[PDB]
Structure formats: structure tokens, C-alpha cells
Amino acid sequence: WDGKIDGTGTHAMIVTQGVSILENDLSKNEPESVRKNLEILKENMHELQLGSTYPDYDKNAYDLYQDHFWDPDTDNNFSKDNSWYLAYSIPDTGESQIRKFSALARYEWQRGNYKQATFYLGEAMHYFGDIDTPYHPANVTAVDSAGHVKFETFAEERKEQYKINTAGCKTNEAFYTDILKNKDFNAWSKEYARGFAKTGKSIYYSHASMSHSWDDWDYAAKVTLANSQKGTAGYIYRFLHDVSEGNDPSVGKNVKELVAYISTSGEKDAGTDDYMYFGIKTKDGKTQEWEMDNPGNDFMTGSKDTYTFKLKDENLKIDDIQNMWIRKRKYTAFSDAYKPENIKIIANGKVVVDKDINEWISGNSTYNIK
Ligand SMILES: [Zn+2]
Ligand SMILES: [Zn+2]
């Protein structure tokens, strides 16, 4: 979807309606906590809107051209066994970004940081809207500097006509009730989002592609924006319940993957061009290292980088992981010290490590974070 850096545009509309939807569908016997947390979200509407649009303008990433179009099965494929050379981190997908930002949002809300939490939530919804955008050609045709395409700008000038204010039922009915059943947030999200994304892919072939008429486009925008709004409301509903009832999705399950959200200091020369690795050591002495690499320029000054690591051993619990570290290895003979500001590690939907560092890492050395 289209959006603007000031928090306006299609993305912001979706997220704004996501709240109205909840405002009207929330049944009477819903817990006060859910109801009062919704009020806190509404009071931070602007932040929700800024988060909803920010990913298309984020300048603290990898200095690459934005493109938010993936095949709906990408995440599922990357999850299968064998289908990936484990020494390499897994690429970021909209599907995985929903989970990352949702985890960051929950962690922040529980520590009282509502503004930061809302922003992160908005970012999670931005990616859900994307996978719900019916645009799936092999070759993309960008029309602006933010990587948007013509279908999105077409929907943008007509966004107001596509609004909805109800999911179709009350939160005490099937749609909302089914959302709370799966205590495994990450598992639920995967199956929940694919549905919207596949329907979106189908709509692309039958209505939204460039060969279809304007009426087909208007209809495509109508049905996919309704799905996006509804789907978004469902996410926000799940979020409110998760943060209200102190719900933990990682409850006693295996850790097949770890996610690193690294904040590099804004101080001059803090970023590095040297090789960077992440590693872990179990209670039984087994170790595994991964190279943190993405298509763009990694670890830039003041950047916020993301790396997904798939484990060899799929039968380890979070507690079995004793140590965690990052390691630098010289690319050239010239100095290129690295200064990370903060490092968060996520496992099964929960922020298990939140560490401020603000220390220089030089030469070929290892910095332990746990
Ligand atoms: Zn978008
Ligand atoms: Zn986007």
C-alpha cells in the first residue's frame, strides 16, 4: 500500500480503521484491561499512523531500494528443513517482520513505553498490509522513490471510498474468538497472514494485474483493503489480549530460530564493513555460528539491522542456550572498529535479551552478550 512519511496515506487509513473496527466490535463482556489498553492505543493514534507508514521511508536500514512484494509461500519455504544453508542468516520477509515488530511492541508495552510500543505495532501492521496488497508480478515497475507501484497509487487516490468500520461480527464471535485459541503467537500469525496473502495473490491474477480494467482495479482495491482493515483489526485485538493478560507465546516450546535486532551507535565511524558473526553455546557444550549478512550494506552508523538464524538442533529450549556472542573478523588490513549501541534477541515471540553495549569492538575479537 501507499503511504507518506508524515503518517498519512493508505497505510495510516488501514491502521486508523483497524481501531474504529475494534471500537465498534468489542463485545460488552471483554476484560477491562483490553478495553483500557485500547484507549491507550487510541490516545497514541498518531504514533500508530507514523509506524504504519515508516517502513517505506526508513533511512536507517541497509541503504537499498524498497520493495515489499513477496510470494506468499516464501516464509513457509524458508522454514522447511534442509532448504537453507544454515551458516547464512534467513532474509527478512513481510511475514517475519510482522512477528519481529509484534514481539518488540509487546515487550515495550509491558515496560510502560506505550509510544514506542504503538510505533512498533504500526510497523507490524505496515507489513501485514503489504502482504495483503494484491501485486505479484515477477518484475516490479516502481513509480516513486519509496518503491510504490501504480496499483497502490491508484488505491491511494480512492482510499476514502474503501473504508469499513466492522469486521462483520462482535469480538465474542468466531472471527475474534478463533484468534485467541492458538497460544502460539508465531504459529497463529503464520497461518493467519498466509490466508490473506494468498487471497491477495489470487486477486492479483483475476483483477489487479496491469491488463485488467479500471473497474477490476477498483473492485480489487475494495476487497483487499477491506481484508487489510479486518485482518489488521484482528492483529490489534490479539495484541491487546496478549499485553492485558500477560500472555506468553514461547511457553515451553522449542527454539528453531533466533532473531537479532541490532542498533548500531549513531556516533561517527560506529558502523563496520568487516565480517560479523553471531554464535551460541548450549549447556552441553555444542556451538553454532552464523554470518550476519543481508543484500545491502550491513552495520552502518546509526542503523537498525535484522538477522534471522536457523538452528541445526531443533530440540533446544531457550534455557539450554547458555551463551550468545557476536564476533568481528577483519575484511582488509585497515582498522574498522564496530560500536553497537543495543542488541535485542528474540526467541519464539519474546525478547529474551535486551542489552546496551556502547563499547568499541576491534580487530578479530568476540563480544559476549550472554
Ligand atoms: Zn505498502
Ligand atoms: Zn511497504
Which ligand minimizes its atom distance to the CA of 147? Answer: 2
320 annotated ligand binder? no
Which ligand minimizes its atom distance to the CA of 54? Answer: 2
DSSP 346: E
Same domain, 186 and 200: yes
241 annotated ligand binder? no
217 annotated ligand binder? no
Method: X-ray
Same domain, 203 and 276: no
Of 218, 250, 282, the residue that ends a domain is 250
Same domain, 137 and 213: yes
11 annotated ligand binder? yes
Report CA(126)–ligand 1 centroid distance (Å): 6
271 annotated ligand binder? yes
Report CA(66)–ligand 1 centroid distance (Å): 10
C-alpha cell at 134: 494484491
81 annotated ligand binder? no
CATH code assigned at 211? 1.10.575.10
Same domain, 44 and 32: yes
- Determine how β-strand 287-291 pairs with β-strand 340-347: unpaired
Which residues hold their Cβ within 5 A of ligand 1, which is an ion?
A: 1, 130
DSSP 92: P
Report CA(315)–ligand 1 centroid distance (Å): 37
Q: How far is it, in rounded angstroms, from Cα 31 to Cα 43?
A: 19
Q: Are 177 and 168 in contact (CB under 8 A)?
A: no
For residue 10, give its domain range: 1-250
Same domain, 259 and 151: no
What is residue 41's three-state secondary structure?
helix
- Cα 191 from chain centroid (whole Å): 15
Of 250, 280, 306, the residue that ends a domain is 250
How many folded domains does the chain comprise? 2
Same domain, 218 and 257: no
CATH code assigned at 255? 2.60.60.20
Same domain, 138 and 178: yes
* Helix %, strand %, coil % of the chain (to 5): 45, 15, 40
Q: How far is it, in rounded angstroms, from Cα 200 to Cα 28?
A: 33
Same domain, 76 and 173: yes
Same domain, 129 and 243: yes
Same domain, 61 and 175: yes
Same domain, 236 and 138: yes
274 annotated ligand binder? no
Resolution, given in Å to one decimal, reads 2.5
Same domain, 255 and 163: no
DSSP 155-197: HHHHGGGG--S--SS-TTSHHHHHHHH-S-HHHHHHHHHHHHH
Which ligand minimizes its atom distance to the CA of 58? Answer: 2
Which ligand minimizes its atom distance to the CA of 129? Answer: 1
Of 185, 215, 250, the residue that ends a domain is 250
